A paper describes a structure:
To understand the molecular basis underpinning the specific recognition of PB [name] for TNC1014,1016cit presented by [name]∗04:01, we determined the ternary complex structure at 3.2 Å resolution. The PB [name] docked canonically at an angle of ∼70° across the central region of peptide binding cleft, with a total Buried surface area of ∼1910 Å2 over [name]∗04:01TNC1014,1016cit. The TRAV35+/TRBV10-2+ PB [name] chain usage was biased toward the α-chain that constituted ∼62% of BSA as compared to ∼38% of the β-chain. In contrast, CDR3β, 2β, 1β and FWβ contributed 17.1%, 9.6%, 7.6% and 3.7% of total BSA, respectively. Intriguingly, the TNC1014,1016cit peptide contacts were mainly derived from non-germline encoded CDR3α and 3β loops, whereas germline encoded CDR1β, 2β, 1α and 2α loops contributed to the interaction with [name]∗04:01. Notably, germline-encoded CDR2α residues (Tyr57, Lys58, and Glu64) formed multiple interactions with the DRB1∗04:01 β-chain, including SE residues (Gln70, Ala73, and Arg72) and adjacent residues (Asp66 and Glu69) via H-bonds, salt bridge, and VdWs, suggesting the importance of conserved TRAV gene usage in [name]∗04:01 β-chain recognition. Five residues in CDR3α loop (109VGNTN113) formed a secondary helical conformation which in turn sat atop the N-terminus of TNC1014,1016cit peptide at position P-1 to P3 pocket. Namely, citrulline at P2 shifted ∼40° toward the C-terminus, alongside with subtle rearrangement of the P-1 citrulline at the N-terminus, which allowed the docking of the conformationally rearranged CDR3α loop. Here, Val109 projected downward and positioned at the center of the P-1 and P2 citrullines, forming multiple contacts with both citrullines, as well as the main chain interactions with P1-Tyr. Another distinct feature of PB [name] recognition of TNC1014,1016cit peptide was observed at Position 5, where numerous interactions were made between P5-Tyr and CDR3α (Thr112, Gln107, and Gly115), CDR3β (Pro110 and Val109), and CDR1β (Tyr38). Collectively, both citrullines at P-1 and P2, alongside with P5-Tyr, are the key determinants for TRAV35+/TRBV10-2+ PB [name] recognition.
Author numbering:
A (entry chain A): 3 to 180
B (entry chain P): 1013 to 1024
C (entry chain N): 3 to 29, 37 to 58, 63 to 72, 74 to 81, 83 to 253
D (entry chain M): 2 to 29, 37 to 59, 63 to 68, 74 to 146, 148 to 210
E (entry chain B): 2 to 190
């Protein structure tokens, strides 16, 4: 049918951060860790059925940084407008007490790609097996991100996702209950 | 097998 | 533009020397090669971007650095005689096309006392040639230098000529059976007879020798064979 | 040697045609041709980025093999200035990801000139300062090959082609010299053809 | 800090139709949220999207080596990477897992909503229909739409607005490219 394989890149100043990733029909195939300078396959099985060792991917982001400095001057130093995200909390599967599950915090339609996301069980921060994806690109050139929290469903625990963004006045909270 | 890189072009 | 420095270099065995490559094209990729006989170009190290370095085919005995998009210094850790080669530097904005530099001729020697400057002499055309061929050929000879870091040029009336010039592609070993033999080089400049017949014209053969530096110590009595120019001139005769 | 460049040595008289080959051990996507002038660095001749492409640059023409593993270069109407080494470069998928190019060993092209009117002769020149002398074997045919001397004390140089431009006169030349007192100019080159 | 931010983006889009039959390569460049220059494989060179990228299009188009390198991207880049991962991207199949449970909109004494939950299926093109006592219920059905989990799975919660009565037999039917036959899940009141 119809398929799209996008190679997305960005560079952000003054944060001096950037990323490099491939995308198939909205899902991340892999990305390049700019710190360890290695390929991080989104699904571990991809690293056995494919391969990607590109030092030039880092050189691409280097070019993006150079092009960014020229474009910033060309635009009379016009900064980017902050687009606040739209946070949503849902479960991997239907909730069953004493049956493990995952709580997903989907941050969508936001720019620039810098956010502060935290899980709050009963208002207390949690960081036991928490996971996240990179900043995924969108069709409208905004960004989206996923955060994952494996948990055991219970009636005593109440969870929240605190997503802070520069387009947000106060840290946005979205609750999930049983 | 093995994914190519598409070179991002530099500007002057 | 990619440029290299030094262009010639005599170092001692075991010393640490660093060849530099400077580019103003703001290219992201840079490469260091070494070209020998029978191996062609061989990648030593290269850099996809600043603060990024990777190894190539011949990365042993070398290190490299790249803290800026301008400079890619190749550095020999401990100079071995096997590292006597011609080192080339390239760069790329968007590969595969690369832009190479002028090259650097490095010569690793055991003792610098084998380094001798060249002796240049000009030889005047023979009358038999001017009668039979109506043309004048001047022969220049540069003998007794080591290593082969020379650049011979011809100068007629203060200008450098290339027409009618022919320099030997390789130098001759004066002591052919010696590995550290001193070298000799010949070159020819053919001008019309009536031009050499005019005594108002000046002919000079020039040899730019790239020898030792003002930092290389010299404990011998012979004059230090530093980078110098040895010339030889001649005037037209009737 | 992931890139097989044949031939490696060529001898072409002026006006004739030249054809170099280059084969890859992996599926290539781009091909590069370089030329290294004596004493200079290699520069780019032609680039091919599409299969079956046939790009030209004057008398140079290069082909991208449809096997994605072969490439050719042709030099039509050889002139003596076409001497030098010709490198063959390319990129596979691994190279493209690393931004590097694999180079072939090369082809050393030596175009020999057309000596229209030969006139083989040997002369002797005198030092502009001193007794000191030197011989000159000049104006011989391109098919002649000068050798070195087992005399050791006698030094015989190799062939050399000078082009007096605007006079339409090319000429070979070879120099010999020795400080042994029993040295005759004509007796020198005859043992070296 | 409160400092201004500046964003540069580059997207190398490969668009595939009918597998590798019709392919389209887009070399897109973005400043912040807006595109300013594009290489369309259909056109053959860079064309500015906004007037801000006109110097980039003119500078790149004047370099013949660059344009010829991008004109080949449909074969050398797009079609290559399509086949590198076709076995585990285009042909990836994951079974859904349908569960049905009742719910209520308002805090009430009886259920008024019945939920069908399809979870963890790839690809995302799916069909979910509701049936009460053999007759399909078209009116009063509110779907969730497709939900991307970000881990190569999908989900959607198609629900039927009904006050279930004792004795009625509801069924939720789902048809997915991974299933060889329609998958049914029943829920008796
Ligand atoms: C999608 O791609 C498939 C191929 O993967 C296309 O099917 C191809 O359709 C053409 C006609 O449009 C067929 O060409 C015909 O072939 C016969 C011999 O079989 C020849 O005698 C005719 O003169 C004509 O050339 C071709 O065979 C066929 N290939 C296959 C493998 O079925 C299809 O049209 C494309 N588009 C869509 C919407 O599917």
């Amino acid at each position: 049918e119809e398929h799209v394989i996008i190679q997305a890149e960005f560079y952000l100043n003054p944060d001096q951060s950037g990323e490099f990733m491939f995308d198939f029909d909205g899902d991340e195939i892999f990305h390049v860790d700019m710190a360890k300078k290695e390929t991080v396959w989104r699904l571990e099985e991809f690293g056995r059925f494919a391969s990607f060792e590109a030092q030039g991917a880092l050189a691409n982001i280097a070019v993006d940084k150079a092009n960014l400095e020229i474009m910033t001057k060309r635009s009379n130093y016009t900064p980017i407008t902050n687009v606040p995200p739209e946070v949503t909390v849902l479960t991997n599967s239907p909730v069953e007490l004493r049956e493990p599950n995952v709580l997903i915090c989907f941050i969508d339609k936001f720019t620039p790609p810098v956010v502060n996301v935290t899980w709050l069980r009963n208002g207390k921060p949690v960081t036991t097996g928490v996971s996240e994806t990179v900043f995924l690109p969108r069709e409208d050139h905004l960004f989206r991100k996923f955060h994952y929290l494996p948990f055991l469903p219970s009636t005593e625990d109440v969870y929240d996702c605190r997503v802070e963004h520069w387009g947000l006045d106060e840290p946005l909270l979205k609750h999930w209950e049983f | 097998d093995r994914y190519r890189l598409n070179y991002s072009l530099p500007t002057g | 533009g990619i440029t290299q420095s030094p262009r010639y270099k005599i170092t001692e065995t075991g010393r640490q020397v660093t060849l530099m490559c400077h580019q103003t094209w703001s290219h992201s990729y840079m490469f260091w090669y070494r070209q020998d006989l029978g191996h062609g170009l061989r990648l030593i190290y290269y850099s996809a971007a600043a603060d990024i370095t990777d190894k190539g085919e011949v990365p042993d005995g070398y290190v490299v650095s790249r803290s800026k998009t301008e400079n890619f210094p190749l550095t020999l850790e401990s100079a071995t005689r096997s590292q006597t080669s011609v080192y080339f530097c390239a760069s790329s904005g968007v590969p595969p096309v690369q832009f190479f530099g002028p090259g650097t001729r490095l010569t690793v020697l055991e003792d610098l006392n084998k380094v001798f400057p060249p002796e240049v002499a000009v030889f005047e055309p023979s009358e038999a040639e001017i009668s039979h061929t109506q043309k004048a050929t001047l022969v220049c000879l540069a003998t007794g230098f080591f290593p082969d870091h020379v650049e011979l040029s011809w100068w007629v009336n203060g200008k450098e000529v290339h027409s009618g010039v022919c320099t030997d592609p390789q130098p001759l070993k004066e002591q052919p059976a010696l590995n550290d033999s001193r070298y000799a080089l010949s070159s020819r400049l053919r001008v019309s007879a009536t031009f050499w017949q005019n005594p108002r014209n000046h002919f000079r053969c020039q040899v730019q020798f790239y020898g030792l530096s003002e930092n290389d110590e010299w404990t011998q009595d012979r004059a230090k064979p530093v980078t110098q120019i040895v010339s030889a001139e001649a005037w037209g005769r009737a | 040697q992931q890139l097989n460049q044949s031939p490696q040595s060529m001898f072409i008289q002026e006006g004739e045609d030249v054809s170099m080959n280059c084969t890859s051990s992996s599926i290539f996507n781009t091909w590069l041709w370089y030329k290294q002038e004596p004493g200079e660095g290699p520069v780019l001749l032609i680039a091919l980025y599409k299969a079956g492409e046939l790009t030209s640059n004057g008398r140079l023409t290069a082909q991208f093999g449809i096997t994605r593993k072969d490439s050719f270069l042709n030099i039509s109407a050889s002139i003596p200035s076409d001497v030098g080494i010709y490198f063959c470069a390319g990129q596979d998928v691994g190279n493209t990801n690393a931004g590097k190019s694999t180079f072939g060993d090369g082809t050393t092209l030596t175009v020999k000139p057309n000596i229209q009117n030969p006139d083989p002769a040997v002369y002797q020149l005198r030092d502009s300062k001193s007794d000191k002398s030197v011989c000159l074997f000049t104006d011989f045919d391109s098919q002649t090959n000068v050798s070195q001397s087992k005399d050791s004390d006698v030094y015989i140089t190799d062939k050399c082609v000078l082009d007096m431009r605007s006079m339409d006169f090319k000429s070979n030349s070879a120099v010999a010299w020795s400080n042994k007192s029993d040295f005759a100019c004509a007796n020198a080159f005859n043992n070296s053809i | 800090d409160t400092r201004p931010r500046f964003l540069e983006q580059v997207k190398h889009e490969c668009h595939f139709f009918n597998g590798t039959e019709r392919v389209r390569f887009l070399d897109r460049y973005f400043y912040h949220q807006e595109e300013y220059v594009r290489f369309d494989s259909d056109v053959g060179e860079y064309r500015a999207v906004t007037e801000l990228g006109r110097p980039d299009a003119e500078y790149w188009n004047s370099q013949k080596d660059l344009l010829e390198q991008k004109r080949a991207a449909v074969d050398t880049y797009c079609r290559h990477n399509y086949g590198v991962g076709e076995s585990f991207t285009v042909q990836r199949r994951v079974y859904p897992e349908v569960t049905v449970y009742p719910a209520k909109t308002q805090p009430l004494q009886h259920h008024n909503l019945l939920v069908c939950s399809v979870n963890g299926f790839y690809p995302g093109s799916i069909e979910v229909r509701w049936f009460r006592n053999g007759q399909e219920e078209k009116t009063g059905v509110v779907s969730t739409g497709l939900i991307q989990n970000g881990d190569w799975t999908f989900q959607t919660l198609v629900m039927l607005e009904t006050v279930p009565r004792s004795g009625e037999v509801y069924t939720c039917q789902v048809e997915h490219p991974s299933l060889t036959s329609p998958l049914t899940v029943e829920w008796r009141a």
